[PDB]
Amino acid sequence: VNPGVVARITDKGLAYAAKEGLVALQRELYKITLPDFSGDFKIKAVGRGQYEFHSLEIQNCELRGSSLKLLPGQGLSLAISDSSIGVRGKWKVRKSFLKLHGSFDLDVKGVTISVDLLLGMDPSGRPTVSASGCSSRICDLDVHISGNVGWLLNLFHNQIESKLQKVLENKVCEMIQKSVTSDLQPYLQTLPVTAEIDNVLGIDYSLVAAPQAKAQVLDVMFKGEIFNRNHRSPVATPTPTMSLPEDSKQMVYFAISDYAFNIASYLNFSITDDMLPHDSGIRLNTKAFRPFTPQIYKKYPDMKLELLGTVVSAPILNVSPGNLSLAPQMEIEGFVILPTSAREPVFRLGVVTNVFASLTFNNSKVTGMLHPDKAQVRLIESKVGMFNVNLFQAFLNYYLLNSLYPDVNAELAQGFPLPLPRHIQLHDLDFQIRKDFLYLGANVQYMR
Numbered sequence: 001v002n003p004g005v006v007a008r009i010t011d012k013g014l015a016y017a018a019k020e021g022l023v024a025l026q027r028e029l030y031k032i033t034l035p036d037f038s039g040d041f042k043i044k045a046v047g048r049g050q051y052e053f054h055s056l057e058i059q060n061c062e063l064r065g066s067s068l069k070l071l072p073g074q075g076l077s078l079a080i081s082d083s084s085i086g087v088r089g090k091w092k093v094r095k096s097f098l099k100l101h102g103s104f105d106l107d108v109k110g111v112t113i114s115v116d117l118l119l120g121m122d123p124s125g126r127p128t129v130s131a132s133g134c135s136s137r138i139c140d141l142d143v144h145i146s147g148n149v150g151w152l153l154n155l156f157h158n159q160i161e162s163k164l165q166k167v168l169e170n171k172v173c174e175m176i177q178k179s180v181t182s183d184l185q186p187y188l189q190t191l192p193v194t195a196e197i198d199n200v201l202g203i204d205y206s207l208v209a210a211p212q213a214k215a216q217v218l219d220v221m222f223k224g225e226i227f228n229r230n231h232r233s234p235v236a237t238p239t240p241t242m243s244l245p246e247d248s249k250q251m252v253y254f255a256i257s258d259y260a261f262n263i264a265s266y267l268n269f270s271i272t273d274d275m276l277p278h279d280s281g282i283r284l285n286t287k288a289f290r291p292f293t294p295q296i297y298k299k300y301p302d303m304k305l306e307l308l309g310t311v312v313s314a315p316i317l318n319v320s321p322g323n324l325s326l327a328p329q330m331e332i333e334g335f336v337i338l339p340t341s342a343r344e345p346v347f348r349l350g351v352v353t354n355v356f357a358s359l360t361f362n363n364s365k366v367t368g369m370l371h372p373d374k375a376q377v378r379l380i381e382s383k384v385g386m387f388n389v390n391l392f393q394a395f396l397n398y399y400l401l402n403s404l405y406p407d408v409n410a411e412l413a414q415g416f417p418l419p420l421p422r423h424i425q426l427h428d429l430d431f432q433i434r435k436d437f438l439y440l441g442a443n444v445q446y447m448r
């Protein structure tokens with residue numbers, strides 16, 4: 001079913017991912033334990049004997065260079081290279097009735113690893129990863145043995161190198177297999193199944209599909225649907241199929257289909273005399289509108305008023321990448337409610353409320369804050385004499401700054417919660433506007 005939100009991970013973001021998984025993996029290779037190599041020898045220079053390289057331990061492991069691509073259809077293909085692993089151990093060579101001792105160190109270079117990361121989804125809507133077809137190639141070997149024993153080096157090269165090489169690549173590939181299922185899969189699953197938005201509503205971030213590894217991008221599609229906290233009555237399920245074109249500037253782009261609070265921005269509304277706070281000195285009654293229209297109090301002395309306004313356009317243009325400049329243009333008509341119980345037309349106003357919105361990221365949520373500006377009023381028509389627009393403008397401002405703007409400022413400050421795994425921080429928000437969905441551009445940083 002069509003997802004509410006969609007996390008599109010770009011090639012750039014897959015690159016970050018690999019680099020960061022690379023340091024986690026590197027620490028895990030230290031847990032690798034090599035076996036012990038023992039057997040007999042018959043060196044033509046010193047005779048036959050027994051040897052043993054035991055207590056092998058990973059001492060150095062440097063995994064640098066890597067590459068995360070897309071396997072269109074199944075998932076990702078990882079490739080780490082130009083790495084190095086150092087190995088340390090002890091040896092004992094029994095020649096004669098004597099027994100020797102010493103240490104050794106190997107330096108492995110030109111190390112290459114390749115694994116496939118299979119991305120899928122479990123019934124519960126949680127992510128799953130699985131490494132398949134792992135293969136590593138251990139080659140450039142540097143052997144150093146304690147004591148300047150020459151035959152020991154030649155002996156290593158003739159009878160242990162190849163074995164150690166394969167044993168090692170085999171263990172490294174097993175660490176990778178294990179590490180993904182015991183660390184990686186439990187990490188992707190740190191992604192919220194459900195996040196609270198407000199103390200009233202909530203969103204469900206269950207997967208509607210396993211991440212879709214497209215040719216150039218990775219799309220992880222979430223249910224993303226709003227649901228009542230007390231008992232989620234599914235009164236919100238129309239969400240269409242979205243499809244934004246190719247934006248590869250940043251690491252991830254979120255596509256957020258719908259919200260609730262002023263996401264709709266043909267937005268009609270009504271203002272009744274009993275919708276303005278009591279303490280707030282503004283009221284919708286002829287006697288109060290007397291200064292605006294000195295004639296209303298004659299034609300309709302002491303009566304209730306109606307305002308039926310409506311948005312007719314909401315021009316949005318970017319200032320900063322994360323700062324919008326919208327000015328909803330509306331037309332309001334004043335009605336005086338006469339004893340005939342039927343509203344009756346008085347005047348019509350044109351208003352343009354210039355505002356600035358500036359978004360940010362803060363703790364997995366997208367947050368914003370309003371930046372109030374000039375509210376412009378222009379008389380459109382009037383069947384009750386001239387209208388002091390200048391005076392009324394001051395009231396339009398009082399109203400907004402004391403109602404409309406403080407609330408919206410709160411709605412934004414509460415923010416929307418994004419689908420992220422643990423320890424992630426987003427930066428450089430590029431908030432571009434599109435069809436039914438908001439398209440949030442961001443870069444990522446793993447809180448190591």
Ligand SMILES: CCCCCCCCCCCCCCCCCC(=O)OC[C@H](COP(=O)([O-])OCC[N+](C)(C)C)OC(=O)CCCCCCCCCCCCCCCCC
Pocket residue numbers: 007009013014016017018019020021022024025078127179180183184185187188191211220251252419420421422424444446
């Ligand atoms: C899933 C929604 C994503 C929405 C957008 C946000 C992500 C944007 C792109 C960056 C993703 C995160 C990168 C950093 C996390 C990955 C590396 C890492 O160290 O994770 C911590 C994990 C665990 O680190 P840890 O064990 O130190 O910490 C675990 C968490 N605590 C501390 C709380 C216990 O690292 C690993 O598990 C390493 C396992 C082997 C990794 C093998 C190579 C993996 C290469 C990257 C794969 C990325 C797949 C992305 C799939 C996205 C869809 C599900």
Ligand SMILES: CC(=O)N[C@@H]1[C@@H](O)[C@H](O)[C@@H](CO)O[C@H]1O
Pocket residue numbers: 266268308309310
């Ligand atoms: C599309 C719609 O809802 N129709 C309303 C119409 O009923 C109302 O009389 C008018 C007032 O300006 O505003 C329109 O938006």
Ligand SMILES: CC(=O)N[C@@H]1[C@@H](O)[C@H](O)[C@@H](CO)O[C@H]1O
Pocket residue numbers: 308309333
């Ligand atoms: C669409 C439009 O221009 N608005 C008019 C106006 O009288 C008022 O907003 C509404 C109330 O019924 O009726 C519409 O016809």
Ligand SMILES: CC(=O)N[C@@H]1[C@@H](O)[C@H](O)[C@@H](CO)O[C@H]1O
Pocket residue numbers: 319320323324356357358371
């Ligand atoms: C936080 C932010 O960037 N928003 C700014 C606002 O602070 C500034 O007063 C206004 C005028 O330049 O432009 C907005 O875009």
Ligand SMILES: CC(=O)N[C@@H]1[C@@H](O)[C@H](O)[C@@H](CO)O[C@H]1O
Pocket residue numbers: 360361362363367
């Ligand atoms: C990081 C960020 O930009 N968001 C801040 C947040 O850190 C802070 O908690 C809040 C006030 O409490 O103000 C937001 O603007």
